[PDB]
Each structure stands twice: as C-alpha cells, then as structure tokens.
Design a protein around this ligand. Structure first.
Ligand SMILES: *[C@@H]1O[C@H](CO)[C@@H](O[C@@H]2O[C@H](CO)[C@@H](O)[C@H](O)[C@H]2NC(C)=O)[C@H](O)[C@H]1NC(C)=O
Ligand SMILES: *[C@@H]1O[C@H](CO)[C@@H](O)[C@H](O)[C@H]1NC(C)=O
Lengths: 23, 68
C-alpha cells in the first residue's frame, strides 16, 4: 500500500500531534 | 525552502502591510520632508506595490538594519 499522502482562515498553510496518512 | 520567492534625514519612506485570505499586500510611498525631527502634519496617500500569495498565519514582525 501507499502511505505517502497525508492530512492534518481561508488559504492558510501549515507545514499527541495531528499527522494522519491515508492508506 | 525559498518555496515562495520573488524579486524586483530628507525623505520619509512609508509602508502599509496587511494579510487577508492568504494574500500579504504591501502599499508604500516615498516623499521629501523639511521637519527632520518627526512625521509631517500634511497629507499624502500610499499606493500598492506588491501582493504576495504566501498563505502564512503572521502574528509578529521585526525590522532589518544594515551593519558595516
Ligand atoms: C495564528 O498564530 C497564533 C499564535 O501566534 C495562534 O493563537 C493562539 O491559539 C491558541 C488556540 O489554538 C490559544 O490558546 C492562544 O492563546 C493563541 N495565542 C494568541 C497570541 O492568540 C492562532 O490560533 C493561529 N491561527 C491560525 C488560523 O492558525
Ligand atoms: C523544507 O520543507 C520540508 C517539509 O515540506 C522539511 O521537511 C524540510 O526540513 C525543509 N527544509 C528547509 C531547508 O527548510
């Protein structure tokens, strides 16, 4: 499987902690 | 990580900075003065020079000084 794709004001960017890989 | 990158007393140099919907907007003016001590009591309007699509939650700022 692939796990390289991940999720956590308008158009703000932000590069226990909120990291969740999709499977 | 220059992930966004862009390139381009006797005078008073003025600026306005604001940050709305992910756009950081810069207005400015340069004008001559005669009160060397402080801001002049007359009137002039600043005009837009830059708009940066940078998307940052800014809450603080600092300013940069040249050292010999
Ligand atoms: C923008 O950054 C500020 C911090 O400089 C964030 O403000 C804090 O938010 C938490 C809750 O998330 C509060 O407990 C703190 O008291 C806040 N501090 C200040 C100085 O306001 C703010 O949440 C960030 N906003 C976004 C949209 O990311
Ligand atoms: C550049 O950003 C990535 C995350 O997108 C980070 O892992 C890396 O350490 C950053 N490097 C620099 C020099 O900013």
């Amino acid at each position: 499987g692939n796990y390289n794709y991940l999720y956590r004001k308008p158009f703000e960017r932000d590069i226990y902690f909120p990291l969740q890989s999709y499977g | 990580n220059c992930t966004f990158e862009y390139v381009s007393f006797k005078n008073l140099r003025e600026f306005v900075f604001k940050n709305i919907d992910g756009y950081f907007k810069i207005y400015s003016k340069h004008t001559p003065i005669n009160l060397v001590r402080d801001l002049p009591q007359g009137f002039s309007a600043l005009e837009p020079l830059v708009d940066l699509p940078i998307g940052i939650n800014i809450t603080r700022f600092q300013t940069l000084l040249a050292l010999h």
